[PDB]
Amino acid sequence: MQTFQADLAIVGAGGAGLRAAIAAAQANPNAKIALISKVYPMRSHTVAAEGGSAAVAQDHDSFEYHFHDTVAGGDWLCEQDVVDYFVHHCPTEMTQLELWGCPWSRRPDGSVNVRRFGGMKIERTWFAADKTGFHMLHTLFQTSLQFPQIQRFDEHFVLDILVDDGHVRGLVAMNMMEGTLVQIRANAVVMATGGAGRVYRYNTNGGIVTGDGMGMALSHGVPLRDMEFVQYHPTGLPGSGILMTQGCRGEGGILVNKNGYRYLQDYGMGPETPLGEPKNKYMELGPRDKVSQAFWHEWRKGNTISTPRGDVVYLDLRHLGEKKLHERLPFICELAKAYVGVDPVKEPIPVRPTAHYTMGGIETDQNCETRIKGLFAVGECSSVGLHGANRLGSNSLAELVVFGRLAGEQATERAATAGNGNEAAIEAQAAGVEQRLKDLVNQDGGENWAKIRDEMGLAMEEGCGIYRTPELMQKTIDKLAELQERFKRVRITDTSSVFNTDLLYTIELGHGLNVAECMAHSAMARKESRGAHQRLDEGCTERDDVNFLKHTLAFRDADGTTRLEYSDVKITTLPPA
Amino acid sequence: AEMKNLKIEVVRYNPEVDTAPHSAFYEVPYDATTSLLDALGYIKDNLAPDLSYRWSCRMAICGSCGMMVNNVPKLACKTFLRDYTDGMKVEALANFPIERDLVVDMTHFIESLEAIKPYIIGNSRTADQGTNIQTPAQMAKYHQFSGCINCGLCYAACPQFGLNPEFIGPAAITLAHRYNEDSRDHGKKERMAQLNSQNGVWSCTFVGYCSEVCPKHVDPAAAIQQGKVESSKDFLIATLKPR
Amino acid sequence: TTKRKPYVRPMTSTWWKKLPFYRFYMLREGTAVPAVWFSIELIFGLFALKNGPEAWAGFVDFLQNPVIVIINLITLAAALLHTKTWFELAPKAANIIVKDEKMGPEPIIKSLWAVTVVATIVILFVALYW
Amino acid sequence: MINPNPKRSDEPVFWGLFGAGGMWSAIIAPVMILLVGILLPLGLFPGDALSYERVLAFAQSFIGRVFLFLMIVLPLWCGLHRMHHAMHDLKIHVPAGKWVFYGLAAILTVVTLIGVVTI
Ligand SMILES: Cc1cc2nc3c(=O)[nH]c(=O)nc-3n(C[C@H](O)[C@H](O)[C@H](O)COP(=O)(O)OP(=O)(O)OC[C@H]3O[C@@H](n4cnc5c(N)ncnc54)[C@H](O)[C@@H]3O)c2cc1C
Ligand code: SF4
Ligand code: F3S
Ligand code: FES
């Protein structure tokens, strides 16, 4: 194994990872930052966004309002000091992104415009178009090119990290094109591997969002906090799971069942608002969870339209006019026309809820540091305590640059004052990763990894859906344990070395199984209803701040079992009520 | 019901066994919603596990999908089997070296894009002063050219690049123009060097296939022409200076 | 050592024969043949014109070959293609903004073809009516 | 790696000429080919508009001389430029191709110049 020297190494070229590389470069102009990703940085999942990034801007807005919408939206499971830091640092990072060339849409006077997302009362979401995550990822990356401190390792699959005496010392990754392993030494490692929505059969995520960094963090005792809160976005295409942006409803679109009845008024979201004026908080602009759950109820009432790709409801957008449909939203119209064969000017779009965002992630303090000294986690793959039981719309993007910058500067600090460690132990850990890989390659049994992935997606979609019951959740737990036993009988029949996607996808499946078990157990033990976690059995259909005002921590020990602990939630100025 | 089956021909290549690429034939069930990316998923799941390829976002925005469909450069996630009932041949993206199956050596693309210095240069404004002032008018000068997803279809479309591998290429040029026409940038002279090269704007003969195959409608050829204009201005100005 | 063996596909001299778009491009460049042919003829008739009515009459007899009339008809055809594709491609080198939107190419194309028709008319008028 | 300090090209010169030429032949060439290649050697013109006397009279006029020089020379630089690049497009190797095609262009430009100062 060849070895590279780096001050700090980042695992993930997403918005969090790129912003962290930039902040760490600007912090230490003499550092050698090893930025790693299994795809070229412009291929990270962040490109796929259409919503926007939250940042307080309007004069009639305040950091108190953003703080309040975040805490309340999270059902008081947010670390409130972290939320305070976040809302106080959003305008500096969105402004800084504007300075780096990000083409935020403009008011006719030259300032940056904002629109309403996540149900906030005061609009504060900056946007480029319906192409915001695209322009922000490409802006961060193209700005990252100008910093020579950032040695990139594009298309490098980070296999494991190296831990000895409670401090991180580097990581072992595979040169994907070459099929050869590489050691990277660094007294600071930042995890920015993105969420893990690919464990669901139907999701809005890219193929690379397999949550590998989370599983790597599990392998070394770090706990995964609040994994039960999987956020479903509503309106999404069937079969594919491709997002229909909330802007569709934000322009006047309606949700209808099989009877043409705007069903949302029957679930506390009434009265019905006219086709003319859409009102925030009402009808199709109501709370996200209540709209998804409303789909579940309409499915129980048999009011859903049966379709081969699955049961759906209809997003009717006809009442906008030719010019507003074809000309104003180009990417969304092209999307619908392409993937469901429907012209939004002529016909209504078939949509249904879909797995979207991973509120959970690696446990981190207020400076994005985990229980291992020198190891950091930022982005969707982390859990700084900003989202709690439910993340607010357009907040994750702002988290990427704010906490990306923070994680960069802090990682520089920790790498500066690390001291040295036992070399024989570290080389022993690297040799251990090498041997573990050899073991996975020589493993035989004849089981197909793909059917295990499919059955895992079905298990997660069934037991851990919008609504959840103890019988089906226990069923998903037992099914995940069964698939865990079947993963040891998998045989990787592709023995090639140049871009062997077989092996890599298999490893991704392993990480996915571990993380999924953490999710299902974290939910089965949380006997209450909070945010995206919604149960139906007696005694758990409401919010319990007396017994469950606490974070679910999920450990995975060496014996393959998923244990749970609970931590307390930091309150500052907004107590739960 | 019963789904129809389509015979897809894929250009495989294993650099450890094969001397030269070769076709393989796979029957794939499909409907009115089956994309080529989905088809590749099925083939690698049930027919040949050693088929490698690049992909991610599943909705044509990331840009790793690039491949050839009947000698037409397309994104595999924006190509649907319903339109190919009479034969379908999938080769790796054209005018690039084939590393494995449908994966190519994207190195030169990366190198060119880095070489045109794609970032804001010469601005001293700091975050504590607020954002720059830019009108929708000032944005429209370059907005279209920013939606480039670095997918590389245009490099498979341009024939001048297939003849000249040192051609920095349509996408790199278009990005450089995007930063030259940004009202917030003052670093045009830093990229004029690569632009005026014979490997720069002066290697395009205006074939125009790039803008045609562009899945994000960037229109890179127009950026190449405006770049020839700016390069001619630069030439004359550099001539009228004596010494 | 690397187990990579990157395969480079060759690009023949017949790359354009495949796709019709390429064929159209190569034709569009192939218009250069009859245009320079026509300028050669223009030199022919110039020096035949200054060499007296004798040489001039010999030149006009050359134009009546009639295979030369065939070639000149093809010359007019190719030159018309050249006007078409030229007016199509020329507006892309302009970055014009009309009220927050990048305009063209239809107005420019209409203007160019208008100027061309005006030219053709004025030329036939001066050349034939007087 | 790409050259960090590449050689600026002289192309902007020929691309310039090839421009103005192509524009010229775009707007003026078709009617000229109709006049000279079709209408004249077929007698399809009223009276003696295309006879030797009137033609020569137009030629020895100043405007006739200039229009003739442009009508000959501009399409020459244009088309010859296109041929130089088409050589490359066809992978036909031509020694001193630059000097060949553009040299012929300047040759016929001097020739046309000697013709428009009247022989
Ligand atoms: C359609 C859509 C729209 C959205 N819109 C919004 C919005 O408007 N506002 C908002 O706030 N949020 C939005 N989100 C959510 C939010 O943007 C995402 O959580 C965000 O993309 C998270 O990105 P990230 O920085 O965590 O890294 P990601 O973008 O998830 O990328 C993960 C990175 O980790 C790397 N990586 C992963 N595994 C490995 C490995 N094993 N080895 C090496 N590298 C690895 C990848 O290469 C990549 O660089 C949206 C999400 C979707 C799907
Ligand atoms: S412009 Fe179209 S083709 Fe050229 S790179 Fe961006 S996406 Fe690929
Ligand atoms: S097709 Fe090729 S020649 Fe230039 S205009 Fe486009 S890069
Ligand atoms: S799959 Fe990401 S762009 Fe087609």
PDB file of C-alpha atoms in Angstrom, chain A residues 103-194:
ATOM      1  CA  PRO A 103     -26.112  33.013  -9.955  1.00  0.00           C
ATOM      2  CA  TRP A 104     -28.871  33.636  -7.429  1.00  0.00           C
ATOM      3  CA  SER A 105     -32.041  34.863  -9.113  1.00  0.00           C
ATOM      4  CA  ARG A 106     -32.361  38.615  -8.846  1.00  0.00           C
ATOM      5  CA  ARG A 107     -34.883  41.289  -8.110  1.00  0.00           C
ATOM      6  CA  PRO A 108     -35.048  43.890 -10.911  1.00  0.00           C
ATOM      7  CA  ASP A 109     -33.011  46.260  -8.703  1.00  0.00           C
ATOM      8  CA  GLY A 110     -30.006  43.913  -8.444  1.00  0.00           C
ATOM      9  CA  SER A 111     -30.401  42.320  -5.016  1.00  0.00           C
ATOM     10  CA  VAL A 112     -30.979  38.601  -4.512  1.00  0.00           C
ATOM     11  CA  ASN A 113     -34.581  37.400  -4.444  1.00  0.00           C
ATOM     12  CA  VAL A 114     -36.141  34.956  -1.979  1.00  0.00           C
ATOM     13  CA  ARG A 115     -39.189  32.676  -2.003  1.00  0.00           C
ATOM     14  CA  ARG A 116     -41.065  30.646   0.610  1.00  0.00           C
ATOM     15  CA  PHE A 117     -40.014  27.085   1.443  1.00  0.00           C
ATOM     16  CA  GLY A 118     -40.548  24.618   4.258  1.00  0.00           C
ATOM     17  CA  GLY A 119     -43.739  26.382   5.307  1.00  0.00           C
ATOM     18  CA  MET A 120     -41.879  29.329   6.830  1.00  0.00           C
ATOM     19  CA  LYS A 121     -43.937  32.468   7.417  1.00  0.00           C
ATOM     20  CA  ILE A 122     -41.212  34.868   6.224  1.00  0.00           C
ATOM     21  CA  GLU A 123     -39.691  33.885   2.887  1.00  0.00           C
ATOM     22  CA  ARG A 124     -35.915  33.614   3.154  1.00  0.00           C
ATOM     23  CA  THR A 125     -34.893  30.859   0.688  1.00  0.00           C
ATOM     24  CA  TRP A 126     -32.339  32.006  -1.875  1.00  0.00           C
ATOM     25  CA  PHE A 127     -32.511  30.250  -5.233  1.00  0.00           C
ATOM     26  CA  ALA A 128     -30.835  30.140  -8.633  1.00  0.00           C
ATOM     27  CA  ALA A 129     -33.873  28.743 -10.468  1.00  0.00           C
ATOM     28  CA  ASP A 130     -35.171  25.218 -10.254  1.00  0.00           C
ATOM     29  CA  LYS A 131     -31.461  24.445 -10.471  1.00  0.00           C
ATOM     30  CA  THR A 132     -30.152  25.675  -7.105  1.00  0.00           C
ATOM     31  CA  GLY A 133     -28.158  22.684  -5.845  1.00  0.00           C
ATOM     32  CA  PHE A 134     -26.653  22.439  -9.334  1.00  0.00           C
ATOM     33  CA  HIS A 135     -25.305  25.999  -9.337  1.00  0.00           C
ATOM     34  CA  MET A 136     -24.190  25.752  -5.717  1.00  0.00           C
ATOM     35  CA  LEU A 137     -22.301  22.477  -6.174  1.00  0.00           C
ATOM     36  CA  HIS A 138     -20.662  23.643  -9.405  1.00  0.00           C
ATOM     37  CA  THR A 139     -19.869  27.034  -7.845  1.00  0.00           C
ATOM     38  CA  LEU A 140     -18.229  25.438  -4.805  1.00  0.00           C
ATOM     39  CA  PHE A 141     -16.254  23.010  -6.976  1.00  0.00           C
ATOM     40  CA  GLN A 142     -15.123  25.485  -9.640  1.00  0.00           C
ATOM     41  CA  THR A 143     -14.107  27.788  -6.780  1.00  0.00           C
ATOM     42  CA  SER A 144     -12.316  24.841  -5.144  1.00  0.00           C
ATOM     43  CA  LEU A 145     -10.113  24.483  -8.236  1.00  0.00           C
ATOM     44  CA  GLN A 146      -8.286  27.732  -7.389  1.00  0.00           C
ATOM     45  CA  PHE A 147      -6.884  26.321  -4.138  1.00  0.00           C
ATOM     46  CA  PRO A 148      -3.773  24.159  -4.714  1.00  0.00           C
ATOM     47  CA  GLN A 149      -3.883  22.922  -1.103  1.00  0.00           C
ATOM     48  CA  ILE A 150      -6.755  20.667  -2.223  1.00  0.00           C
ATOM     49  CA  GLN A 151      -5.212  17.507  -3.647  1.00  0.00           C
ATOM     50  CA  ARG A 152      -8.223  15.686  -5.087  1.00  0.00           C
ATOM     51  CA  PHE A 153      -8.631  11.910  -5.338  1.00  0.00           C
ATOM     52  CA  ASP A 154     -11.553  11.686  -7.742  1.00  0.00           C
ATOM     53  CA  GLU A 155     -13.227   8.291  -8.108  1.00  0.00           C
ATOM     54  CA  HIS A 156     -11.627   6.858  -4.969  1.00  0.00           C
ATOM     55  CA  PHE A 157     -13.815   4.566  -2.856  1.00  0.00           C
ATOM     56  CA  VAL A 158     -13.017   5.200   0.803  1.00  0.00           C
ATOM     57  CA  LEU A 159     -13.092   1.720   2.335  1.00  0.00           C
ATOM     58  CA  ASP A 160     -12.431   2.274   6.032  1.00  0.00           C
ATOM     59  CA  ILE A 161     -10.902   4.675   8.513  1.00  0.00           C
ATOM     60  CA  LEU A 162      -7.931   4.056  10.792  1.00  0.00           C
ATOM     61  CA  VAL A 163      -8.529   4.511  14.530  1.00  0.00           C
ATOM     62  CA  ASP A 164      -6.080   3.868  17.376  1.00  0.00           C
ATOM     63  CA  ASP A 165      -6.268   5.094  20.996  1.00  0.00           C
ATOM     64  CA  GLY A 166      -9.464   7.020  20.288  1.00  0.00           C
ATOM     65  CA  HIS A 167      -7.883   9.252  17.622  1.00  0.00           C
ATOM     66  CA  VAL A 168      -8.214   9.073  13.821  1.00  0.00           C
ATOM     67  CA  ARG A 169      -4.986   8.820  11.817  1.00  0.00           C
ATOM     68  CA  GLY A 170      -6.142   8.409   8.219  1.00  0.00           C
ATOM     69  CA  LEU A 171      -8.171   6.179   5.955  1.00  0.00           C
ATOM     70  CA  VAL A 172      -7.805   3.314   3.489  1.00  0.00           C
ATOM     71  CA  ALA A 173      -9.438   3.814   0.080  1.00  0.00           C
ATOM     72  CA  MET A 174      -9.365   2.129  -3.332  1.00  0.00           C
ATOM     73  CA  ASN A 175      -8.207   3.780  -6.541  1.00  0.00           C
ATOM     74  CA  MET A 176     -11.311   2.886  -8.525  1.00  0.00           C
ATOM     75  CA  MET A 177      -9.823   3.027 -12.016  1.00  0.00           C
ATOM     76  CA  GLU A 178      -6.746   1.040 -10.910  1.00  0.00           C
ATOM     77  CA  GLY A 179      -8.253  -1.368  -8.372  1.00  0.00           C
ATOM     78  CA  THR A 180      -5.280  -0.764  -6.063  1.00  0.00           C
ATOM     79  CA  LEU A 181      -5.494   0.283  -2.430  1.00  0.00           C
ATOM     80  CA  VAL A 182      -4.076   3.507  -0.980  1.00  0.00           C
ATOM     81  CA  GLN A 183      -3.407   4.735   2.552  1.00  0.00           C
ATOM     82  CA  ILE A 184      -4.012   8.401   3.328  1.00  0.00           C
ATOM     83  CA  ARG A 185      -2.482   9.649   6.577  1.00  0.00           C
ATOM     84  CA  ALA A 186      -4.174  12.634   8.221  1.00  0.00           C
ATOM     85  CA  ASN A 187      -4.657  13.713  11.838  1.00  0.00           C
ATOM     86  CA  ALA A 188      -8.184  14.870  10.906  1.00  0.00           C
ATOM     87  CA  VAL A 189     -10.854  13.194   8.753  1.00  0.00           C
ATOM     88  CA  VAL A 190     -14.207  14.817   7.876  1.00  0.00           C
ATOM     89  CA  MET A 191     -17.141  12.631   6.791  1.00  0.00           C
ATOM     90  CA  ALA A 192     -19.300  14.232   4.079  1.00  0.00           C
ATOM     91  CA  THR A 193     -20.669  11.096   2.420  1.00  0.00           C
ATOM     92  CA  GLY A 194     -24.286  12.249   2.195  1.00  0.00           C
TER      93      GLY A 194
END
